[model samples]
Target: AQSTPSAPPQKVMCVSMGSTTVRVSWVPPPADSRNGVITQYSVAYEAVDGEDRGRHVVDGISREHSSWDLVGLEKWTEYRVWVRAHTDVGPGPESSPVLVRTDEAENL
Candidate 1:
């Protein structure tokens, strides 16, 4: 039987946006019951359009928290971010779409 990529359904949450970075926070479902412990969490995000198009991942996060930074971006740009939960149990579902922006005032 094909074990469909099983994971928490839309369990990620609390996304914050900054001028040069995007911070997302999430609550992982209890996974101690599973075969593997929640060794770490991975944060993945991508800017959906424009010259900023890219996906980045931050690994080794031991808590239910995660974030991504869009470096070397133009001023006042918008970034779309998405996050997912990961563990020795496997990668959970992804959170809802989120948007981040770089403000021009940040240059000051």
Candidate 2:
């Protein structure tokens, strides 16, 4: 039989705060919303340029964190990002997507 799944994160958001960086943040679901102790989280993203930027993931992060800074992204480009919580059982469904466009690269 299938077991109960962990709840999705809340207040998922992203902001383009640099030439090649985007900041992502979210609030973890309540403990009662999960079936197991919270483990870690994975933030996944894909470039919207559709030029084979491919999917990327930032993993092995502590549950204590509510934000992540994504770097090395193309400047003046768009990206779709999402966050998913993990538990002793497995990973939960991803949070709602956040679309952001990076700012122009620094002229320096």
Candidate 3:
């Protein structure tokens, strides 16, 4: 019989770092929780408030990479981001959402 999937990703963070682009970070769920090897990750995001707005997603990120960057976000807008781990069997539960506000665009 097939076992159940992992618990979920933990410590999810959307590192905006005072810019429109942000890096999503997370630690793999506990080893035991990972019923199977984690093969990939999926990041889901959207603008909470802004002009350029809609839900966006990035999937099939290699497990080797711990973070992913999201670009072209609206300046001075708030966003919500989360991540989930995909094992050989299926995807685990989603990580907690991280809310962040973009910093004003710097003059180039």
Candidate 4:
């Protein structure tokens, strides 16, 4: 039977940060863990400390892309982000979440 990737992406991190956005990057899962051809990637994020506890997801990322910019985030807020790989079968488990804080607004 076809199977999804068996492991999450590695080294998930915030490569850059701004007042309202963050650039996140990660390495693909180990070849052994990829049960089938990797088709895409997904990122999930949410505020670490806020009343707006809504989580957000970014999908349809090309398999050739290893990084993504997460925009429209709240300024000066801490967020937890995760990355996961997907295959023809389905998505794999998410990576260990990385913590990042947006830069404070210049005028604030």
TM-scores of all models? 0.60, 0.87, 0.84, 0.91
Residues 1-108 of candidate 3 have per-residue lDDT tens digits of 444345777888776755678877888888887787889998988888887577788989998887888887787888988888888778888887899778865424
Per-prediction CA RMSD (Å): 4.4, 2.8, 2.6, 2.7
Ranking by TM-score: 4, 2, 3, 1
Q: What is the per-residue lDDT of model 4 for residues 6-52, given as tens digits with 9 covering 90 to 100?
A: 89999888843568888999999998899999999999999988566
* Model 3 clashing residue pairs (backbone): none
Against the true structure, candidate 2 reaches a TM-score of 0.87
Candidates by lDDT, descending order: 4, 2, 3, 1
For model 2, the superposed segments whose C-alpha errors exceed 4 Å read 1-5, 105-108
The TM-score between candidate 4 and the true structure equals 0.91
Off by over 4 Å in 4: 105-108
lDDT of 2 at 69: 93
Model 2: per-residue Cα lDDT over 13-105, one tens digit each? 998888888989999887677677678888999999846579999997798999999988887789999898888678888887889988875
Tell me which of candidates 1 and 2 scores higher on TM-score. Answer: 2
Query: At residue 23, what lDDT does model 3 achieve?
Result: 75
Root-mean-square deviation of Cα positions for candidate 3 versus the true structure, in angstroms: 2.6
